[PDB]
Amino acid sequence: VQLVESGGGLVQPGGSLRLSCAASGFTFRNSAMHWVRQAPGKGLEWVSSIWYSGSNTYYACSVKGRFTISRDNSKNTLYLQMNSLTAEDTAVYYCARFAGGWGAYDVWGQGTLVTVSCDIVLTQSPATLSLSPGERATLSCRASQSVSSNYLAWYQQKPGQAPRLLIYDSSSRATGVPARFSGSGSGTDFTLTISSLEPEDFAVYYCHQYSDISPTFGQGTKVEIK
Amino acid sequence: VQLVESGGGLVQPGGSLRLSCAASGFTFRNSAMHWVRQAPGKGLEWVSSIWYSGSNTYYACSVKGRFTISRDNSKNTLYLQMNSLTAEDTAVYYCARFAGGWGAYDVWGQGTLVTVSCDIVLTQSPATLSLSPGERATLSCRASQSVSSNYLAWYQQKPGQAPRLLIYDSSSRATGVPARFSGSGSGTDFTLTISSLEPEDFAVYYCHQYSDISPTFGQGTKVEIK
């Protein structure tokens, strides 16, 4: 009684792969068959299920509209057709026989890895600054490698609004930006200093490097009232 | 000087939408134009870039192979064609003019929300258990609503291996599982107890409800050596 899995491998986003699972040792046509996946370092996640011709196939929302489950009972084979793949679909994929009250997922395929794949990382600190008006906020943006030509910008974002450019070229204030916003630093260490905070200044602030063709943003620092 | 965005809305996974951005106030035909997005409650993320005809278009790996950036300079309009949409593409999408060392993203569209959408949540606690051989491990699995027929299972998973069924129907220890594994509980409160831990028992353990057509797993508990 076993499920012999086949397929997988490394593809580019938008590509497609077909997985298969050959069953033996049980009456295949009577069993419901599921796909389950597990992203690297993550937990198990149901993907899709299929039972008998005329009963419903089901899909997790994560794959619905792109993946197709099917079976060929004469071949004792379960399939998963994976179309328009995304990097987020990277995972080990398992087929499993579903035994319901007689055993949940009691037979598993060995799993096959599907990897979908095609960089300056900005780390902002701290994540949150709880401060009062009149005080000074100092925001740090550290880059995993040197940011060429000080091509670093800071944006302010209020809730429900588009980002607003504050600083570009690490230290140049954009039009309309008050002197109490000050950018500085170089190489891998950049800071935004906001002196004598006003209530309007409480917002999220993102740093942005445009020193290469793969632009990156920090994860933001939220400055909030105390 | 502005970017007037339009489009967006709510679609189902695998569907498609086209966004657009009409520019005025600057020489659009010569501009570098980017799309940037922001998942709800999350940070800014570059999506795609387009510039003069003798240059290439670029895409973040998150959208490459599914999205297409384009421009119609005679209409001063930028487009993003979004195909095979995914729940993870849910985000506010911004167009922006890119000015490099003369201003980074210095003009922003106001943003439009794209939502892509179509549940018994299992909460395992604690997340990790540091124990030594001979001690007893007690693992909890809490369901957000009642698990019909107590259709709840436990799996053991070792690194590089497929999950192994231990318990189903809340308390049925599968054939071949040692008696030191014991499942109990009902309704929304389930427990796996591993008495007299042996070296082979250190692993990750998942619970799994199969009481409806949308199977779910807990996020696992790692039982690890102290």
Author numbering:
A (entry chain G), B (entry chain A): 2 to 119, 125 to 232
Question: Could you share sentences copied from the article?
Answer:
Diabodies are among the smallest of these bispecific antibodies. They are constructed by connecting heavy-chain variable fragments (VH) and light-chain variable fragments (VL) with short “GGGGS” peptide linkers. Therefore, the two VH-linker-VL chains associate to form a dimer with two antigen binding sites, each consisting of the VH and VL fragments from the different chains. In order to investigate the structural flexibility of the Fv interfaces of diabodies, we have determined the crystal structures of 10 mono- and bi-specific diabodies with and without bound antigens.
Although changing Arg83 to a threonine substantially reduces ambiguity in predicting diabody structures, they remain significantly diverse, which limits their use in designing protein nano-assemblies. In order to reduce this structural flexibility and prevent chain shuffling, we introduced disulfide bridges between the VH1 and VH2 chains in the Fv interface. The sites of the proposed cysteines were designed initially using the “Disulfide by Design” program, with the crystal structure of diabody 6052 as template. In order to examine the structural flexibility of the disulfide-bridged diabodies, we determined the structures of three of them. All were designed by the “Disulfide by Design” program using the crystal structure of the 6052 diabody as template. The three diabodies have practically identical structures regardless of large variations in the crystallization conditions. Some of them were crystallized in a buffer containing a high concentration of salt and organic solvent while others were generated in a buffer containing polyethyleneglycol. The pH of the crystallization solution ranged from 3.5 to 8.5. This demonstrates that the introduction of a disulfide bridge can essentially freeze the structure of a diabody under a wide range of experimental conditions. The disulfide bridges we introduced were located between the Fv domains and can essentially lock-in the relative conformation of the Fv domains in the diabody.
